[PDB]
């Protein structure tokens, strides 16, 4: 009942005892495996109790002093109000633990290093905007990127929700034409359609930074133009392919996910944007080369005079490596923090080992940890992984419309 | 009914065929073990009952004359003998089906074009060897490879199993070295040692083809050398890197897996070697670049003048891509069937469509279907998949030593 986990490069074996804690049921049954799919009153007290017992054991404070104390004041807080507020340190410990538990995150070696901005006293979209702008400018930090999460007020009934309607704080526009097809990013066509539907002047280009749609409780959302000086972008050039610059490609510095629902101790914050720094294959492989994304693969391959007539020339593979080389080169030249998929996976192997020592395991979604290029060249490929849900966590959540 | 999205297009289907998944896999709602490499007359009757049902569905004669008799026949035979015998056409259909049902085979567009050699009358290790040479000979076909399988006598009470001890009909010796390392293929150290123990005179090259260890029932395994001219190999060169030929690398033409058990209607064939043709990534990425295999990646990158001192230069990705180029080119130059990961994955997408119209789904192991380089460059990356066990099937089995 303790999963045997092997690494096929070294031969080492470990057991994931930590898997025994899994709260929210996963999508997989004995009869079918759905791991490859992307999106598969006083119950609050169970999750509240568990999270507090975590915190105190983590500060080597099990069964003493403030432990039983803090247990009572949340027993009382929920008793009176039907909810509870987190101690500042707990909201910090929960944000760090959610990141620690995100199975699909390959950068969790960094999980202990996170800056939590507390926006729990937020009211109105104009309020979030400055909180977001503080985060953004803090996280960006002139390119020396720093992980951060801004936690907006939790959720209560009879009130609306705090929601950032964008999936990320920096997203590129996507525009249709007299022929349906898209200029810009097709992953944002919808929110790009909303932003114009809420009165934003649409640009022309293929790299217009979208305006934020911020929503305050029980209130239709307000458009916000991000300060251009606040959106650090990296023009993409290639170290030795002088024409790559001419392709006019750019990506933004800050990967800030603004659509996931932080969940700590049974409290659900539908607006808790977190941000780190990119891994280069996110940009160079998925964002630019996915056929439903910028789909630049063939364009770059033409410019390299590759043979696009036969699949076995590996022109796709060759042009994709160069797009990734441009990404890493351009971010480094702009001194923007970025990590290549080799460095990143190797650190994750280091993380798995730390977590084996610390908590006897680590929930890891194999298919998202293995990078989208050069899979078996990175060690995580040869590492078996166990996927389960631990709390606290980042969860997906419905689009706020 | 699991809903399955294709993210490249937006396609959405529901895998109704998963509902017939008979045997159980390793995943629970608690934890996903997808990424793990290695996850009574009445039961023999229901398996047989079902397969016979299957077979009569395929010949468009479901519930017909022959259908009832075969059920009662098989039951009377199982009652009388404890087991039953497949008719030859049932055997051809159960070997094709077991390839159809193989979740980890990207090459399943070919599942109906399968040459089934009935060796169920085999009598000794020696006859076994002859059947196998004729399999290799038929399949290799001078480089125009043909998919084939030889079904040796089924497991049955009172007699031990036929076994091919070798994991594949063509394998390269792996000699543990003086200084603790391996010469040849490290994946084949065990089987090499067994051969030597069984009186094989070892070589000392890197691409020494292994002898066959063939076990007739209730017999020690017997050692059989393959005629050199039966084992078509391909010397590896690069279309532009001319120093590449000086690496002395070779791979063989025929991927013939010989250690898997073939299951049809509850009957078990512990020896049924099957062969297709290679997908270049198996050779180019896995076999040559896995750190625990031939592990050539650094030597190629050094020879390529790549900067191997930083990972951000993507020297691993660049060097791997040219190794795969070399494999593809070397095999086309030698007129030996080979499919690249772009072509293979694109025909597997057709397979999934054909299988959806045919059976309402298709068992697929994403982590095995997605190639180990350039994953998201291929369409199967952006296809969600439902992995489950159908029968007939190729199963793993314990090594007979
Ligand atoms: C510091 C460097 C970081 C790196 C290099 C990194 C990298 C990644 C990558 C490559 C993914 C895969 C997602 C995709 O490809 O779509 C991912 C997912 C994820 N990351 Fe991290 N990340 C970092 C920091 C963080 C932080 C600070 C948080 C939160 C506090 C976080 C939370 C998550 C979550 C929840 C997911 C899963 C989201 C989803 O399923 O869409 N990451 N990360
Ligand atoms: C004709 C062209 C074929 C191609 C291109 C092909 C391709 C592949 C590949 C790439 C794998 C993954 C193996 C690995 O990555 O190590 C695989 C696995 C597998 N294939 Fe195919 N294959 C072909 C033919 C066949 C045939 C003829 C059969 C059976 C009659 C078959 C049954 C299987 C099975 C059972 C597995 C899983 C073996 C394992 O789990 O280790 N394949 N195939
Ligand atoms: C193409 N990836 C989209 C995507 C989807 C979800 C999350 C990320 C993410 C989040 C963070 C904090 C860092 C990072 N490097 N990535 C990215
Ligand atoms: C790195 N491959 C090892 C391996 C392991 C298991 C199966 C294969 C296989 C089998 C067949 C019939 C065709 C093919 N193309 N591959 C290969
Ligand atoms: C269909 C498949 O599950 C889906 O495309 C997943 C696979 N792995 C991934 N891995 C990462 N890091 N990001 C992704 O978007 C995906 N997509
Ligand atoms: C540990 C991990 O599951 C293992 O290396 C798997 C991953 N996916 C694979 N996919 C294929 N096709 N072949 C393999 O050998 C593997 N190995
Ligand atoms: Cl992104
Ligand atoms: Cl192989
Ligand atoms: Gd030119
Ligand atoms: Gd040359
Ligand atoms: Zn699973």
XYZ file of N, CA, C and O in Angstrom, chain A residues 175-271:
388
model
N -6.777 38.541 -31.985
C -7.810 39.198 -32.779
C -8.201 38.333 -33.969
O -7.341 37.716 -34.600
N -9.495 38.316 -34.299
C -9.990 37.600 -35.469
C -9.949 38.506 -36.703
O -9.491 39.650 -36.644
N -10.449 38.005 -37.835
C -10.399 38.751 -39.090
C -11.619 38.431 -39.948
O -12.530 37.705 -39.536
N -11.607 38.968 -41.174
C -12.605 38.663 -42.196
C -12.487 37.209 -42.635
O -13.031 36.816 -43.675
N -11.756 36.408 -41.843
C -11.559 34.990 -42.116
C -11.325 34.192 -40.833
O -10.677 33.140 -40.872
N -11.819 34.681 -39.695
C -11.761 33.921 -38.459
C -10.394 33.806 -37.805
O -10.269 34.052 -36.601
N -9.373 33.424 -38.583
C -8.003 33.224 -38.106
C -7.513 34.378 -37.234
O -8.055 35.484 -37.303
N -6.482 34.137 -36.421
C -6.130 35.011 -35.303
C -4.775 35.669 -35.542
O -3.804 34.999 -35.922
N -4.719 36.985 -35.316
C -3.480 37.725 -35.102
C -3.311 37.907 -33.597
O -4.259 38.299 -32.909
N -2.118 37.596 -33.086
C -1.885 37.564 -31.652
C -1.939 36.171 -31.046
O -1.640 35.175 -31.713
N -2.335 36.074 -29.780
C -2.316 34.799 -29.087
C -3.697 34.170 -29.103
O -4.630 34.736 -28.511
N -3.874 33.001 -29.732
C -5.202 32.373 -29.746
C -5.629 31.808 -28.405
O -6.821 31.530 -28.232
N -4.714 31.629 -27.450
C -5.113 31.155 -26.128
C -5.878 32.209 -25.336
O -6.430 31.889 -24.279
N -5.923 33.448 -25.821
C -6.556 34.545 -25.114
C -7.646 35.231 -25.924
O -8.218 36.213 -25.443
N -7.930 34.751 -27.136
C -9.007 35.218 -28.010
C -10.278 35.531 -27.234
O -10.947 36.539 -27.489
N -10.618 34.660 -26.285
C -11.841 34.822 -25.510
C -11.753 36.024 -24.574
O -12.600 36.923 -24.616
N -10.732 36.057 -23.712
C -10.590 37.189 -22.800
C -10.263 38.461 -23.575
O -10.657 39.560 -23.166
N -9.557 38.337 -24.705
C -9.396 39.467 -25.616
C -10.744 39.943 -26.136
O -10.967 41.149 -26.303
N -11.656 39.006 -26.410
C -13.002 39.382 -26.829
C -13.763 40.046 -25.688
O -14.518 40.999 -25.913
N -13.563 39.576 -24.455
C -14.208 40.224 -23.320
C -13.673 41.638 -23.125
O -14.447 42.590 -22.979
N -12.344 41.797 -23.144
C -11.750 43.105 -22.873
C -12.259 44.163 -23.844
O -12.516 45.308 -23.451
N -12.410 43.802 -25.116
C -13.005 44.729 -26.069
C -14.492 44.892 -25.782
O -15.034 46.003 -25.843
N -15.165 43.795 -25.425
C -16.579 43.847 -25.071
C -16.834 44.694 -23.827
O -17.980 45.093 -23.587
N -15.797 44.984 -23.035
C -15.895 45.902 -21.905
C -15.250 47.250 -22.204
O -14.941 48.004 -21.276
N -15.024 47.560 -23.480
C -14.682 48.911 -23.882
C -13.207 49.233 -23.978
O -12.792 50.338 -23.624
N -12.403 48.289 -24.461
C -10.978 48.514 -24.660
C -10.689 48.706 -26.140
O -11.181 47.949 -26.982
N -9.889 49.715 -26.449
C -9.486 49.971 -27.828
C -8.516 48.888 -28.284
O -7.424 48.763 -27.711
N -8.875 48.076 -29.281
C -7.989 46.988 -29.710
C -6.837 47.491 -30.568
O -7.001 48.366 -31.422
N -5.659 46.912 -30.342
C -4.494 47.242 -31.128
C -4.453 46.522 -32.467
O -5.373 45.806 -32.868
N -3.341 46.724 -33.175
C -3.102 46.029 -34.435
C -2.222 44.795 -34.273
O -2.532 43.746 -34.841
N -1.157 44.882 -33.478
C -0.055 43.943 -33.562
C -0.328 42.562 -32.982
O -1.402 42.241 -32.469
N 0.708 41.724 -33.075
C 0.683 40.347 -32.608
C 1.223 40.195 -31.188
O 1.415 39.065 -30.726
N 1.463 41.301 -30.484
C 2.029 41.247 -29.140
C 1.522 42.414 -28.303
O 2.287 43.045 -27.565
N 0.230 42.717 -28.414
C -0.399 43.719 -27.560
C -0.708 43.106 -26.203
O -1.390 42.082 -26.123
N -0.203 43.732 -25.140
C -0.502 43.276 -23.788
C -1.944 43.615 -23.444
O -2.363 44.781 -23.510
N -2.705 42.602 -23.051
C -4.111 42.804 -22.764
C -4.294 43.650 -21.505
O -3.457 43.634 -20.594
N -5.376 44.410 -21.439
C -5.758 45.042 -20.176
C -6.387 44.030 -19.227
O -7.034 43.067 -19.644
N -6.177 44.259 -17.932
C -6.757 43.402 -16.910
C -8.248 43.659 -16.775
O -8.712 44.797 -16.872
N -8.998 42.590 -16.546
C -10.393 42.681 -16.123
C -10.437 42.239 -14.666
O -10.372 41.044 -14.365
N -10.527 43.208 -13.766
C -10.586 42.937 -12.340
C -12.018 43.097 -11.853
O -12.729 44.018 -12.269
N -12.433 42.200 -10.962
C -13.819 42.109 -10.523
C -13.873 42.196 -9.007
O -13.206 41.422 -8.312
N -14.649 43.138 -8.503
C -14.885 43.213 -7.071
C -16.164 42.472 -6.723
O -17.043 42.301 -7.576
N -16.283 42.004 -5.472
C -17.507 41.317 -5.033
C -18.812 41.940 -5.513
O -18.954 43.165 -5.539
N -19.754 41.082 -5.918
C -21.065 41.447 -6.448
C -21.020 42.662 -7.370
O -21.908 43.519 -7.324
N -19.995 42.738 -8.223
C -19.823 43.874 -9.111
C -19.309 43.415 -10.472
O -18.320 42.660 -10.534
N -19.962 43.814 -11.561
C -19.379 43.628 -12.892
C -17.996 44.249 -12.958
O -17.711 45.227 -12.249
N -17.113 43.718 -13.798
C -15.690 44.030 -13.684
C -15.294 45.294 -14.434
O -15.981 45.757 -15.346
N -14.144 45.831 -14.035
C -13.620 47.079 -14.564
C -12.350 46.823 -15.365
O -11.504 46.016 -14.969
N -12.225 47.514 -16.492
C -11.005 47.456 -17.281
C -9.889 48.245 -16.608
O -10.117 49.296 -16.003
N -8.665 47.734 -16.739
C -7.480 48.388 -16.192
C -6.350 48.295 -17.201
O -6.005 47.194 -17.636
N -5.782 49.439 -17.572
C -4.603 49.461 -18.431
C -3.361 49.325 -17.562
O -3.088 50.190 -16.728
N -2.629 48.231 -17.730
C -1.385 48.068 -16.994
C -0.395 49.148 -17.420
O -0.324 49.490 -18.603
N 0.361 49.719 -16.488
C 1.407 50.671 -16.870
C 2.419 50.016 -17.793
O 3.006 48.977 -17.451
N 2.628 50.581 -18.988
C 3.598 49.986 -19.923
C 4.992 49.823 -19.336
O 5.654 48.812 -19.601
N 5.456 50.785 -18.538
C 6.749 50.629 -17.882
C 6.759 49.479 -16.880
O 7.840 49.060 -16.449
N 5.592 48.961 -16.511
C 5.497 47.884 -15.541
C 5.462 46.511 -16.177
O 5.531 45.513 -15.454
N 5.331 46.432 -17.496
C 5.242 45.154 -18.195
C 6.610 44.920 -18.828
O 6.883 45.315 -19.964
N 7.498 44.292 -18.071
C 8.813 43.960 -18.596
C 8.669 42.886 -19.667
O 8.131 41.801 -19.411
N 9.117 43.199 -20.876
C 9.104 42.254 -21.975
C 10.520 42.073 -22.500
O 11.389 42.942 -22.347
N 10.739 40.921 -23.117
C 12.030 40.586 -23.704
C 11.859 40.432 -25.209
O 11.213 39.476 -25.671
N 12.387 41.353 -26.003
C 12.460 41.109 -27.446
C 13.297 39.866 -27.722
O 14.370 39.669 -27.146
N 12.791 39.002 -28.587
C 13.443 37.724 -28.811
C 14.405 37.870 -29.981
O 14.013 38.292 -31.074
N 15.675 37.580 -29.729
C 16.666 37.497 -30.784
C 17.459 36.211 -30.608
O 17.376 35.538 -29.578
N 18.189 35.859 -31.625
C 18.924 34.616 -31.571
C 20.411 34.930 -31.568
O 20.850 35.829 -32.299
N 21.207 34.232 -30.755
C 22.645 34.557 -30.699
C 23.324 34.625 -32.061
O 24.137 35.529 -32.286
N 23.011 33.719 -32.987
C 23.745 33.650 -34.243
C 22.879 33.700 -35.494
O 23.436 33.782 -36.593
N 21.555 33.629 -35.373
C 20.649 33.743 -36.517
C 20.143 35.186 -36.532
O 19.078 35.507 -36.004
N 20.921 36.057 -37.176
C 20.695 37.498 -37.156
C 19.278 37.895 -37.563
O 18.796 38.942 -37.123
N 18.589 37.078 -38.356
C 17.240 37.396 -38.811
C 16.149 37.110 -37.781
O 15.032 37.616 -37.939
N 16.430 36.312 -36.744
C 15.401 35.995 -35.753
C 14.801 37.259 -35.135
O 13.582 37.359 -34.948
N 15.657 38.221 -34.774
C 15.195 39.531 -34.320
C 14.136 40.116 -35.257
O 13.081 40.591 -34.810
N 14.394 40.061 -36.563
C 13.475 40.609 -37.556
C 12.094 39.965 -37.503
O 11.106 40.608 -37.880
N 11.996 38.717 -37.039
C 10.689 38.084 -36.914
C 9.781 38.829 -35.952
O 8.583 38.535 -35.910
N 10.321 39.766 -35.172
C 9.510 40.611 -34.309
C 8.872 39.908 -33.127
O 7.803 40.326 -32.672
N 9.509 38.872 -32.589
C 8.911 38.105 -31.507
C 9.338 38.661 -30.157
O 10.481 39.093 -29.982
N 8.401 38.650 -29.207
C 8.629 39.070 -27.830
C 7.851 38.144 -26.910
O 6.855 37.546 -27.318
N 8.309 38.040 -25.659
C 7.492 37.481 -24.588
C 7.690 38.297 -23.313
O 8.677 39.016 -23.160
N 6.738 38.183 -22.391
C 6.814 38.967 -21.170
C 7.649 38.252 -20.111
O 7.855 37.034 -20.149
N 8.152 39.048 -19.166
C 9.119 38.569 -18.183
C 8.455 37.768 -17.078
O 9.031 36.784 -16.601
N 7.230 38.123 -16.714
C 6.620 37.644 -15.481
C 5.533 36.617 -15.745
O 4.463 36.979 -16.263
N 5.734 35.341 -15.383
C 4.637 34.380 -15.479
C 3.772 34.457 -14.237
O 4.151 33.948 -13.180
N 2.615 35.101 -14.339
C 1.779 35.357 -13.176
C 0.395 34.771 -13.407
O -0.387 35.325 -14.180
N 0.090 33.670 -12.721
C -1.161 32.944 -12.928
C -2.242 33.569 -12.065
O -2.169 33.528 -10.831
N -3.277 34.090 -12.714
C -4.272 34.911 -12.045
C -5.673 34.321 -12.159
O -6.663 35.054 -12.146
N -5.781 32.996 -12.276
C -7.100 32.391 -12.414
C -7.285 31.155 -11.543
O -8.322 30.495 -11.651
N -6.334 30.831 -10.677
C -6.437 29.660 -9.821
C -6.843 30.059 -8.413
O -6.604 31.180 -7.953
N -7.433 29.103 -7.724
C -8.143 29.344 -6.480
C -7.313 28.744 -5.354
O -7.328 27.529 -5.134
N -6.574 29.600 -4.655
C -5.826 29.151 -3.493
C -6.783 28.627 -2.434
O -7.841 29.212 -2.176
N -6.402 27.513 -1.820
C -7.240 26.826 -0.846
C -6.350 26.463 0.333
O -5.460 25.616 0.200
N -6.558 27.127 1.469
C -5.818 26.856 2.695
C -6.820 26.621 3.817
O -7.788 27.379 3.963
N -6.576 25.578 4.611
C -7.405 25.250 5.757
C -8.898 25.307 5.500
O -9.669 25.685 6.383
N -9.324 24.929 4.301
C -10.723 25.019 3.945
C -11.206 26.411 3.614
O -12.418 26.611 3.468
N -10.306 27.383 3.499
C -10.652 28.704 3.003
C -10.284 28.782 1.530
O -9.234 28.291 1.122
N -11.155 29.391 0.734
C -11.012 29.405 -0.715
C -10.894 30.846 -1.198
O -11.866 31.608 -1.148
N -9.704 31.218 -1.658
C -9.454 32.543 -2.198
C -9.493 32.451 -3.715
O -8.499 32.042 -4.326
N -10.603 32.805 -4.372
C -10.664 32.711 -5.839
C -9.758 33.698 -6.577
O -9.720 33.676 -7.816
N -9.029 34.555 -5.866
C -8.112 35.511 -6.480
C -6.865 35.543 -5.604
O -6.846 36.206 -4.562
